[PDB]
Paper text:
To elucidate the mechanism of FliH-specific assembly with FliM–FliN, we co-crystalized the FliM(SPOA)::FliN fusion with a FliH(1–18)::lysozyme fusion. As with its injectisome counterparts, the FliM–FliN SPOA1,2 did not undergo large conformational changes upon APAR binding (1.11 Å r.m.s.d.); however, the binding mode for the FliH APAR is radically different. In contrast to the OrgB pseudo-lariat, the FliH APAR adopts a near-linear conformation along the ‘top' of FliM–FliN. As observed in the SpaO–OrgB assembly, the FliH APAR makes extensive contact with both SPOA1 and SPOA2, supporting the observation that the FliH APAR interacts more strongly with the FliM–FliN heterodimer than the FliN homodimer. The FliH–FliM–FliN assembly is characterized by the burial of several highly conserved hydrophobic FliH side chains. Two tryptophan side chains form an aromatic clamp, which binds hydrophobic pockets on opposite faces of the FliN thumb. Similarly, the bulky side chain of FliH Leu15 fills a hydrophobic pocket on the thumb of FliM. The binding interfaces for these three residues are formed by both FliM and FliN and are highly conserved across species. This structure presents a conserved model for FliH–FliM–FliN interaction, which is distinct from that of SpaO–OrgB. It should also be noted that while previous investigations of the flagellar T3SS have focused on the interaction between FliH and FliN specifically, our structures and biochemical data show that the FliH APAR more strongly interacts with the FliM–FliN complex than with FliN alone, suggesting that the FliM–FliN complex is the physiologically relevant binding partner for FliH.
Type III secretion systems (T3SS) allow the transport of protein substrates directly across the double membrane of Gram-negative bacteria. Proteomic analyses have identified the major components of the sorting platform for the Salmonella typhimurium SPI-1 injectisome: the AAA+ ATPase InvC, its regulator OrgB and the proteins SpaO and OrgA4. Here we show that a novel, heterotypic interaction between SPOA domains serves as a scaffold for sorting platform assembly in both injectisome and flagellar T3SS. Our structures suggest a partial model for the subtype-specific assembly of the T3SS sorting platforms: the heterotypic interaction between SPOA domains within a given T3SS subtype functions as an adaptor for ATPase and its regulator through interaction with the APAR peptide.
Residue numbers in the entry:
A (entry chain B): 17 to 99, 144 to 227
B (entry chain A): 1 to 182
């Protein structure tokens, strides 16, 4: 009540100079992922298969990442025995999101391996591309023969990319 | 058009495969059962784990060997429960992947609701694409949502005659669109 489950389709390691030059039509090459990580507030919480359900992008949860063993039906122990003119050209990661879903806590905590989660993104409709956790663009997954990529369909201005990048 | 992009290469917009419907995994565990050692299945072919067909045709040497490549170790015709589990996982996805790339099965699969898509995967899981694509008239019937007609036709097959208890369950799923047979 209420958090966002966020599915990352891919992370694309680019240099800042490439990012400042990106324009609609540019294709960023990627490896097609088989499993992907979903996160909450930037924290990875599960790995999963992905695909579509009813034309919506969706996840089949494979593994919870570092799950907590439920021991709430027993008393807490006092101890645990387990106790600028020239800008530097930095590498920057673009995150491409398959989509997000808003879920309640109760709902989030009640999924395990094999849980199917529907995302708010439609298949075909462009994906969010982020920088430092900020939306800067949209793109579409695209492929020739054997090679996969992400084609930029829409993007903010260089000055604004820089702005989201720094913060 | 939504955008005005300069297009050099022939890039094709990609959409991922549909996820397998529920409850196909439980469904298939019921019909395929589990064996951790190579056996001849209800259609005479060498199988392992949860309905994992090893060789289309004779014999054990190739079976044990294609098992050896499937698992990635010496196996000696015997695998682990969690090896069987991971083969199963792969198999279910590969079945769906194959249906969606099958010029004949794909329009039928698309037609069907989720429960009936499970039934179709179950068939393909059992007989393979080429086998299931042979039920021409039952398929067209399925595509056209004539449930009783497809259902009664499906009971008139070799498939049904060779495995009546499984085929009945699958045909009950096709007919009803429900899970009551499971």
């Amino acid at each position: 009540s209420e958090l966002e489950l966020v599915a990352n389709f891919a992370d694309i390691p680019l240099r800042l100079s490439q990012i400042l030059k990106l324009k609609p039509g540019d294709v960023l090459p990627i490896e097609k992922p088989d499993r992907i990580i979903a996160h909450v507030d930037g924290v990875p919480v599960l790995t999963s298969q992905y695909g579509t359900v009813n034309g919506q992008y969706a996840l089949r949860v494979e593994h919870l990442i570092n799950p907590i063993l439920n021991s709430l039906n027993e008393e807490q122990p006092k101890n645990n025995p387990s106790d600028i003119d020239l800008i530097m050209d930095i590498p920057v990661k673009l995150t491409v999101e398959l989509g997000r879903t808003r879920m309640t806590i109760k709902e989030l905590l009640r999924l395990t391996q094999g849980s199917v989660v529907a995302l708010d993104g439609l298949a075909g409709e462009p994906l969010d591309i982020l920088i430092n956790g900020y939306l800067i663009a949209q793109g579409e997954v695209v492929v020739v023969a054997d090679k996969y990529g992400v084609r930029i369909t829409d993007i903010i201005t260089p000055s604004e990319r820089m702005r989201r990048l720094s913060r | 058009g939504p955008v005005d992009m300069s297009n050099e290469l022939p890039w094709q917009v990609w959409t991922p495969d549909d996820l397998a419907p529920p409850n196909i995994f439980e469904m298939l565990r019921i019909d395929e059962g589990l064996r951790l050692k190579i056996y001849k299945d209800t259609e005479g072919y060498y199988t392992i784990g949860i309905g994992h067909l090893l060789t289309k045709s004779p014999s054990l040497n190739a079976a044990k060997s294609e098992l050896d490549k499937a698992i990635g170790r010496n196996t000696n015709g015997v695998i682990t429960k969690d090896e069987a589990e991971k083969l199963f996982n792969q198999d279910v996805d590969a079945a769906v992947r194959g249906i969606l790339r099958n010029a004949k099965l794909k329009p039928v699969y698309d037609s069907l609701d989720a429960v009936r898509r499970a039934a179709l995967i179950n068939m393909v899981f059992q007989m393979g694409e080429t086998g299931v694509a042979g039920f021409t008239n039952s398929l067209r019937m399925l595509q056209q949502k004539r449930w009783d007609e497809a259902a009664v036709n499906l009971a008139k097959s070799r498939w049904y005659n060779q495995t009546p208890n499984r085929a009945k369950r699958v045909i009950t799923t096709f007919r009803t669109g429900t899970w009551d047979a499971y």
